[PDB]
Design a protein around this ligand. Sequence first.
Ligand code: Y01
Ligand code: 9IG
Ligand code: 9IG
Ligand code: CA
Ligand code: CA
Lengths: 314, 51, 51
Amino acid sequence: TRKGIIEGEPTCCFECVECPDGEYSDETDASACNKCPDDFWSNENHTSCIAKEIEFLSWTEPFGIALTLFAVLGIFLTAFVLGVFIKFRNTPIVKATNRELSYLLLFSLLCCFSSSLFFIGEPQDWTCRLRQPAFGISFVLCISCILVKTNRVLLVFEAWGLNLQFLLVFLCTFMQIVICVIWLYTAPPSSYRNQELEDEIIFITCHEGSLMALGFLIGYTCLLAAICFFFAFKSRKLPENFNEAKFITFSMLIFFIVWISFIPAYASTYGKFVSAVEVIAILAASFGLLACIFFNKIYIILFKPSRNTIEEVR
Amino acid sequence: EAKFITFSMLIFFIVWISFIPAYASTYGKFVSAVEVIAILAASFGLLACIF
Amino acid sequence: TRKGIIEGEPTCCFECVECPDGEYSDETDASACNKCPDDFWSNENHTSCIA
Ligand SMILES: CC(C)CCC[C@@H](C)[C@H]1CC[C@H]2[C@@H]3CC=C4C[C@@H](OC(=O)CCC(=O)O)CC[C@]4(C)[C@H]3CC[C@]12C
Ligand SMILES: COc1cccc([C@@H](C)NCCCc2ccccc2Cl)c1
Ligand SMILES: COc1cccc([C@@H](C)NCCCc2ccccc2Cl)c1
Ligand SMILES: [Ca+2]
Ligand SMILES: [Ca+2]
């Protein structure tokens, strides 16, 4: 509490008035209040200054707990599918869906699920620099593996030594990696201590250096997804590999629905939970692809292996 | 109509789960905007997929 | 801007302390910042109160 002038009365006759928020008076008979220093805010009685609460998506927060559980479950499912594909690597079903491409796709799916874990926790500089590029590269690799696994994609390109499948996935991912290198070399993101949205707490955000580069990452990812969707849709009715193109189409629609929904969800989320939505979108898309590429096959491989033959896989 | 039912309900679940961090972190006009956008997305997805 | 007390110096010698948000001072040589009424906040200059 500080002194206030009682009009007419001398200096020794003063009123007592409480300090405003953000200012404090530690000692008694104070003529003015003291603003709390940077990163500090007044306490509940304006008696002293206490540190502002540092807000971010926490690992121990129940929302973060659920998101970590879902990412762990996704990694577990991807490793399970990889294990099934490895033990049954000599079966016709695993041979048909190119085993090397399936292994690389599962590696990229593990990377996709793990990349969501770079959005939980207190944002550091390197974490913010790796968030967007990690998911971008991993998902471009996924869409490249799928996009060269379908019909009328490798044929049109082929019309050295290693398969053209790997050359195509390398080029498609290399464009993304070049974009990311240009980004983190010219305008890398950083960890920003935002003290403007709220006055009693400090948000920790990832300030992306160039929104042009982030837009380029997203545009390239969506362009590859659209190419994959179109080429699978032109061949969706084909029954090869247990209707592989139909499920590729399903996965691409799941991806597009997830990100079109990500638009308003991100544009309407404030505070720490913004990182939240990112994780969910990531997870969902990954899960989609995973299911649409493997669960069916996994069934036919583990249970009722009668169709695990060259004739049935067709 | 199996895939159409599946995709309609996938749109419903995906949209409503996507807006959970918005419903738990926003107030004012924007929370009602979240409500309207989620409802419209669900209804449009169901109508499109089924019809 | 209200009048703040200089310790050890008489009443005629005061400092100019800006009114905080929510309160305001409309007159000159004011010794107290007055809070805006209910459903009313203070404008940028703290010279009046707007709804
Ligand atoms: C975030 C998590 C909860 C999503 C991961 C998906 C899983 C819940 C799995 C378990 C049940 C799976 C489904 C179980 C059954 C089918 C039927 C199957 O339909 C067929 O055309 C095959 C016909 C046959 O089985 O002979 C296609 C795969 C699908 C949709 C599977 C897709 C992936 C699903 C939904
Ligand atoms: C859609 O495919 C993708 C390709 C790369 C990254 C991503 C995800 C992981 N980040 C969304 C980026 C969202 C965003 C937009 C503007 C400013 C900040 C932010 Cl954070 C998706
Ligand atoms: C989700 O299905 C519903 C069933 C009944 C009502 C409603 C709407 C009209 N109000 C609650 C919306 C709150 C909410 C709940 C879960 C996920 C996101 C959100 Cl934003 C939705
Ligand atoms: Ca007097
Ligand atoms: Ca004196």
